[model samples]
Target: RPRFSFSIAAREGKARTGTIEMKRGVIRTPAFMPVGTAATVKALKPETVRATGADIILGNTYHLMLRPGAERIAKLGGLHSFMGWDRPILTDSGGYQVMSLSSLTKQSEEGVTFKMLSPERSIEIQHLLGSDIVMAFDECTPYPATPSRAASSMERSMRWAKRSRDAFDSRKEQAENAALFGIQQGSVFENLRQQSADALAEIGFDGYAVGGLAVGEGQDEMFRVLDFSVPMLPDDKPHYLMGVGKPDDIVGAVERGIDMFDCVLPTRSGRNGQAFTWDGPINIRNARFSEDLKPLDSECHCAVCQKFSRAYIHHLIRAGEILGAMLMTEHNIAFYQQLMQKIRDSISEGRFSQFAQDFRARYFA
Candidate 1:
């Protein structure tokens, strides 16, 4: 019943299954937080999203700040009430998006700054959103960087991370109730990652994230980096792998000890006529599916999969119908939730390795 706490229920090799106890709700470990950019999960209502079994959903600070705006949302009520998603919301501090312009920024030991924003401002805005989990501002560290460059950028992210902690702390009443997570940025360097983790540990946070991956680095390189980077974090706190990745990428990260994830693959691909199944991802637009009578995923239990046929969906997508987007997206989200549940159950049963192996084999077969 604690508002904020993380504990492992079981461990299977390096894979762990646990629960993050938050006031909004409890999130099962190895969880997939559907990306609800602009304050809503695209194409689905809040209740529908919740029915998919998502314990939490992610919000974008940058986008919200530009859309209805933070002040407007705060006045109407916080993000949870506004969106009618009373579960839990994690807000990304702006650095992930702004730092895309890293090449044009000015750096100092304290932190980097550009024409666009400050850590204090980004964190402040997210705090106003009343997000249950807040991410510290961090550089989207570029891939294939030199050791020195990686360390400096990593150090910069840590510096800004400190600012975020203080900014959130300035409003202690709400801050005490919310959880702020630190992000580790060091490109692919183990030493730099260790330093980033140590720095964040010293500063302290409710959770931590492995930033700067899935940014053009191939899956092999990302896994190599996580092999050495994940353990450097405090295992007691939730470890989030930011802006990561495909189904296979999530599988690999969980094996390496990551506990949380967010990505745009579901809605994005679904809108484009793609469907993810226990079997694998399939483009519903393919000519072969035009007359197929099977559901999008034979194993799925979502409303769409329960009642709709692949050929019917194919017809919708081919005609660019709006209903197709909603149904496909809902199915994909449901699949991801089922996928994570399978992972949690596998780890709890001490068969995570077998689960991971079988999943990969079947997903690729």
Candidate 2:
């Protein structure tokens, strides 16, 4: 059995470039993992997904466990074979979805009990997927919570974290290659955040995730928590932030020393005709693009950018052609991958701070 090793290639300020060596593959640090919520990154083939330069992708245990079940996937020879993506996969425990989808959920020391949305069903689904990186199940406390409410939520999550850890430890067969990550949740309360982090660190895991943000907490507050919470985790392991953010958000989080991130922004935005670029995000369906002949970004090297014009994309979108969604999604994914490469390169060259400043200037201007 091979153990996970993280190597820092270079550093610039708090930002650094690195890689995660797992039994499955090497996942580049400060990597942007595309979200494959229901087992697939919509509009993309697994090979094409890899071609976008992503070292790993994120899967949701909640959705998959509810619909197809982990037992089914295991019988189908695991997620890699079932999804046709041989690269590394990080699966989130069902906590977030449980909070969102499952109603009538009651919390206790054992675990939360809830009825599945489907009729005639109730399941205590925990983290069952044998993923390369499995997140510990914990409630992502809602933002703007009062300190007391936040404390209660954090306490509940801490109990759940212990249960998740014990459960993962019992899965001996999958435990070797698979790593479990504990999520810290405390809303925006600094003291609560610290307490949660300390508790999770005490319980320990293969990795740690800064969760409960990106719910509604603005960027400034989120950054404040990260500024303190990030250093509190076990530095030897990877640091993941769940459901995090735009291009600027990624840049900011990387600068603050976050190692891994997964978000639905790129693909979701693409479907809505939004494209990310170095200069800024653009709406591909805008009337102003009706006659524009240039690619989405002249600086981009993606096939969609290289082969098609904004004018053509606009026409396709207006016509409601599936090709438009595919092309836009492809470009968006490629754009994020390229951005990750640039960030890694900048960090390696000891110019990440400058790069970040310049990126903000151009992107926000």
TM-score of each: 0.96, 0.94
The most accurate candidate by lDDT is 1
User: Please, what are the lDDT tens digits per residue for candidate 1 over residues 1-365?
Assistant: 66598989999877888999988899999999999888889999999998999999999887788778888999989899998899889999866665563458775554456645677877778877988898888777677888888887887788888988899888886587888999998898888889999999999999999998978889999999999999999979999999887899999999999999999999899999889998999999999999999999888889998899999999999999999999999999999999999999999998989988999999999
- Candidate 2 CA-lDDT value: 0.81
Deviating ranges (above 4 Å) for candidate 1: 99-116
**What lDDT is reached at residue 200 by model 2?**
93
Q: Any runs in candidate 2 off by more than 4 Å, and if so which?
A: 116-128
Worst 10 residues of 2 by lDDT: 117-126
Local lDDT at 234 for model 2: 82
Model 1, CA-based lDDT: 0.88
**In candidate 2, which residue pairs clash?**
none
